[model samples]
Target: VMDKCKKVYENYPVSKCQLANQCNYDCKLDKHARSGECFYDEKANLQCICDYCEY
Candidate 1:
């Protein structure tokens, strides 16, 4: 099922990135991603967790 997925890179910080589209689109590596998501420590702090397919 989940055979070809690997998180190779350390997910980057997004202190001001507002939405998933920004993180999903711009903050990705290699112009390739399986999925991406925006995270927040609070309403003010955020991060970009970009994921990619290694296979």
Candidate 2:
């Protein structure tokens, strides 16, 4: 699937997820992310897991 882009949110210093609702909203509304979730990485760093549909 081309959904998970694995952006890593590396563009900014923002780490760890505080707002669960906002997470999905940001991805859904802010961007074209169909669905999203804040998941912790291997280092316990919060990151985005969003789905982007092709059609």
Candidate 3:
């Protein structure tokens, strides 16, 4: 069983995602969603979607 789930963005270079925001697995919704506030910028919000998550 999965003991825990985490975003694992901490200590990671934000430049990779082009954003400084991250979630701690719990925030991660599903395969398509990394979290509700993963990319919370002043202008807009962006979500991470996986190939399988798409309809």
The segments of candidate 2 whose C-alpha lies over 4 angstroms from its true place after superposition are: 1-16, 53-55
- Candidate 2 RMSD to the real structure: 4.0
lDDT of 1 at 29: 46
Q: Estimate, for each residue in 1-55, the C-alpha lDDT of model 1 and write its tens digit.
A: 5664434235554543665376667536444776666655566455665566543
TM-scores, one per candidate: 0.43, 0.59, 0.24
lDDT of 3 at 52: 20
Q: Estimate, for each residue in 1-55, the C-alpha lDDT of model 3 and write its tens digit.
A: 7443333333433343554443323234433343423454466543432222212
Arrange candidates by lDDT, highest first: which order? 2, 1, 3
Candidate 1 ranges with C-alpha deviation above 4 Å: 1-16, 27-31, 41-45, 53-55
Q: How well does candidate 3 score on lDDT at residue 49?
A: 23
lDDT of 3 at 32: 38
Candidate 3 collision pairs: 7-25
Give the per-residue lDDT digits (tens) of candidate 2, residues 7-55. 4333422442575466667667756677666777789876766556543
TM-score quality measure for candidate 2: 0.59
With a 3 Å backbone cut-off (N, CA, C), the pairs that clash in candidate 2 are: none
